[PDB]
Amino acid sequence: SDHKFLTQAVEEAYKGVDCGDGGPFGAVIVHNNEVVASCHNMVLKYTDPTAHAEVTAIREACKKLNKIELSECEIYASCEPCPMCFGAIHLSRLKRLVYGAKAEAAIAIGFDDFIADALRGTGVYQKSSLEIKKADGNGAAIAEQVFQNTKEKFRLY
Amino acid sequence: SDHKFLTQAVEEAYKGVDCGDGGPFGAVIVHNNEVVASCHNMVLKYTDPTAHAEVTAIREACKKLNKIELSECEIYASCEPCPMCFGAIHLSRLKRLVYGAKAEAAIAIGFDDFIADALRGTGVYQKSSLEIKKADGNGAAIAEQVFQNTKEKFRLY
Ligand SMILES: O=c1[nH]c(=O)c2ncn([C@@H]3O[C@H](CO)[C@@H](O)[C@H]3O)c2[nH]1
Ligand SMILES: O=c1[nH]c(=O)c2ncn([C@@H]3O[C@H](CO)[C@@H](O)[C@H]3O)c2[nH]1
Ligand SMILES: [Zn+2]
Ligand SMILES: [Zn+2]
């Protein structure tokens, strides 16, 4: 289960940078092993700084399911979600988050040092009880390599 | 002119509640005293839990200006932006936030305890640097009243 959908999110990241749609980030939203949305970062295509992969997937899933809560769904993120996307994941009531690469791997290629306190458990005000899994082993090593692999293929934003 | 634009965001909150578009939240984005976007929460209208007033206004301002950064603009929010919206405000590079009511005003009528550490100055991994003003006096009174005036006028989400 987790390897397959994490891998799908990684493939979306590569697809989006190759499309020119946005940065190397992918996200896949799954409903009891059925894929609901499979998206990548669309900031450049949409001229929308909120159109991260995770936000785009949530928007698409909710529209497809005619529901604003995704409480029976899980989300696979190629990279650790940022504070905005972690907030979106919270609001959408997704029940589980699996992510591949740590935020540091994106920051290593120039992305903003912009990390979600609530994901890392470092907040005073914002807490999370969302079930969160940081992948390890194979899928994770693949996910971490995305940023070195796509560095020269898109413009930072 | 802070009071004028904060009042317009509170107006948007009431209009959206009256429309059935979403909850009692508005946001106005401004360039040197000219309105670039004026929006309210569209979560119900769009079946999109990311379509908070602030995210909606950022998307609309970025479309109107045809670019993904708003570093010359300021944003007026009728209520303290949540972690998702404050993350979007960070990513859009808005240079200043003026907000009307404290989050507790909205929590008091049914919304989640869901507060942005980085806005309140308790973030560790998320470090804001935009200028933030919490409205006082009449601005605060109008903004806090929204939640008493609109109680049980809309579907919670
Ligand atoms: O959650 C995210 N999804 C994206 O699509 C995305 N695109 C760029 N970023 C930035 O990558 C860093 C690591 O999370 C942060 O600077 C994000 O804003 C993203 N973060
Ligand atoms: O920033 C926000 N914009 C909104 O449109 C909105 N709609 C509802 N809420 C919720 O109000 C509380 C105080 O910020 C949190 O539960 C928000 O999710 C909102 N927060
Ligand atoms: Zn994000
Ligand atoms: Zn919000």
From Swiss-Prot, chains A, B:
Gene disruption: observed consequences: No visible phenotyper under normal growth conditions.
EC number: 3.5.4.15
Keywords: Cytoplasm, Hydrolase, Metal-binding, Nucleus, Zinc
UniProt note on tissues of expression: Expressed in roots, leaves, flowers and siliques.
Catalysed reactions listed for this entry: guanosine + H2O + H(+) = xanthosine + NH4(+)
GO BP: any one term: purine nucleoside catabolic process
Location(s), subcellular: Cytoplasm; Nucleus
GO molecular function: guanosine deaminase activity; zinc ion binding
Residues the record marks as active site: E54
Domain CMP/dCMP-type deaminase, first and last residues per copy: 1-114
Entry GO terms, CC: cytoplasm; nucleus
Annotated binding of Zn(2+), by residue: H52, C82, C85
Task of the protein: Catalyzes the hydrolytic deamination of guanosine, producing xanthosine and ammonia. Deaminates exclusively guanosine and 2'-deoxyguanosine but no other aminated purines, pyrimidines, or pterines. Deamination of guanosine by GSDA is the only source of xanthosine production in Arabidopsis.
Family, per entry: Belongs to the cytidine and deoxycytidylate deaminase family.
Name this polypeptide is given: Guanosine deaminase
Part of the intact protein present: 29 to 185 of 185
